[PDB]
Every structure is written in structure tokens, then in C-alpha cells.
Amino acid sequence: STGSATTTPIDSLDDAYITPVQIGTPAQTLNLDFDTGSSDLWVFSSETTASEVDGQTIYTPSKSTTAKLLSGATWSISYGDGSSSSGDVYTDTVSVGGLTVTGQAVESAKKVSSSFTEDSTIDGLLGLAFSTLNTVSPTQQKTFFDNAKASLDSPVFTADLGYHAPGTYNFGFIDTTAYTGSITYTAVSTKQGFWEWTSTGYAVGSGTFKSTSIDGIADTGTTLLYLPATVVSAYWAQVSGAKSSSSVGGYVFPCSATLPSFTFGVGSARIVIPGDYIDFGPISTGSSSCFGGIQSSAGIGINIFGDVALKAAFVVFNGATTPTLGFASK
């Protein structure tokens, strides 16, 4: 089997992407944030504290003839950005782009943190990291991909995120029309539960390529590109007036600037992030200080190839017995 679904930016900055997901019988369609940095499929629901729901579409398990309470199971998650959610668990039928999993754990939120409430466009998350990170207790649950894998034509999914435009998540096949040149594959460590890999270096603009190993994760659920402070300083030094602002929480730059591109290495191959992808707009409405899309990972404890990086590539998440990651230009 295969599946194919369009993923759509939630706003004009590509702060996140939402993909429609069918849950239950009859289908309840919720728009979920597909997150290769976590491993829980959780939703706003009829159980979510009323004051914490603000415009989201909810899953109502009592209206699904295929929903079953997973008795005794609870979940609780905290994300790198300080947000969180928790609740109980149902199993139900879940379909993405025509690909159906029966008995998928659907984690129903009883509580969500303010960041989730305040984002009316995101009805929940669909985790696509390794199932070892799933938070369900006392019986850990599998991700949608892990459950689908054996049925797929090939044990893969691909992320093709758009810049200020829709893109595509495919399951079970590689669309050879969706990228240019060849796909370069690179090794993955699953030791921390992530799609963790090592970039071979970087360049800033038309500058020379610096060969250096950068360990990090491919994370569709993180907006920006978080890299070591040395790398990030080298980038922003090429933008007149750019500075790290402790008050704002990262690098800012004059909105009048033209940003240079940023290149990262995948083996001997190179992915070029155009400068415009690195512009996250005014820090507040009407400001002439703009927020940068490349930020320091110092104090996160891991480098993160988030959407800023991934949307410059066609990315293969290869879930074969020994997982790997593939990157192509597009």
C-alpha cells in the first residue's frame, strides 16, 4: 500500500505545516502537525478541558463506531519549546492520504498548554520519530508509520515541504518526479529515538565550504534551523546589522537586508537553503527588526534540522531494518 497527503503551511511564515488525517468511523478529519521529532499521535478532543480549546477541530471518540478505550493507558509529553499536553488513549482507524491503519493509538488530550490552545490551526500532532519515544504508559504504543510499515510497498516516508506553499508527505514510495538529480543517503543513529544524522559541513552564501561534522536531527516539527553557535555566528556575520538579542531570544536582522543562502552537506552532496527561507519577518507587527531562521542550538543540547532546512530538500525517511535518511535538491 501507499499514501499521499498534501501538507499546508499554517501561516505566511511557514511556522508549521498541517496535514489532514481521517480518524474513526465515520471519518473525523483533523489537521495534524506531522512531527519527525516526536512519537505520539495526539488530538484535541471532546475530553479536552473546555477553556483550553480555542477554534480547533476535536475528535469525539463516542461518535466513532471503531473507537475503543485503551484501558488504563495515559500519556504526557513535553516538547523542546516548553509546550506540553496529556490525557488518555483510544485505539481507532486512522487514514493519511489513502493509507489506513486499524488499531492506531489515538491519544486524546485532557490538557494542553497555552501554545497549543492559542494555535487554532493545529488540531494535534502525528509523531514520526521512533516508537521508543512514545509516551503512553504502561504499554508504549507504535507510531502511525511503525504500524503501517509492514503493509507499505517500501518501508519509507518522504517529506517535501514547500516554501510559502503546500507540499507533500508520501508513505510507501519515492516519487522520482519530485526532486532533481540524485538522492544522497546518509547513516542514522536511533539511539536517542530521533532521525539523527551527521551533516558533513556548511557554507554561507557564495563562501567556501567548511568540512566539519554536525550531528543533528531531521525534525519536521521544529520551525527553524538550530546549529552550533560557531556556525550561526559565521552566518549572521555576513548580514550587516544582524545581532543576537537576549531580549528577543535569538538573532535578529534589519528587515531591509538581503539574506545570503546557507548550504549544508549531506555526504559529498550539498543542499542550498535560499536566503529568503531564513526570513521570519518582523519581531512584532510594524517592527523593522526581523527574526532569523538560523539560530543557535547552544543550550538545546542537540542540533535541529527543522523546516528551514528540510523545505530546501526532498527528504526520505527510510525505515528499513537499518534506517537511513536521504536528501535531494528539488
Curated annotation (Swiss-Prot):
The keyword Hydrolase applies. The active site is at D35, S199. The keyword Magnesium does not apply. One of its GO terms (biological process) is proteolysis. Its EC number is 3.4.23.22. Disulfide bonds join C255-C290. Keywords: Aspartyl protease, Disulfide bond, Hydrolase, Protease, Signal, Zymogen. Residues 17-328 form the Peptidase A1 domain. It comes from the Eukaryota. It catalyses: Hydrolysis of proteins with specificity similar to that of pepsin A, prefers hydrophobic residues at P1 and P1', but does not cleave 14-Ala-|-Leu-15 in the B chain of insulin or Z-Glu-Tyr. Clots milk. One of its GO terms (molecular function) is aspartic-type endopeptidase activity. Belongs to the peptidase A1 family. This is Endothiapepsin. It comes from Cryphonectria parasitica. The gene is EAPA. The chain holds residues 90 to 419 of 419 of the full protein.
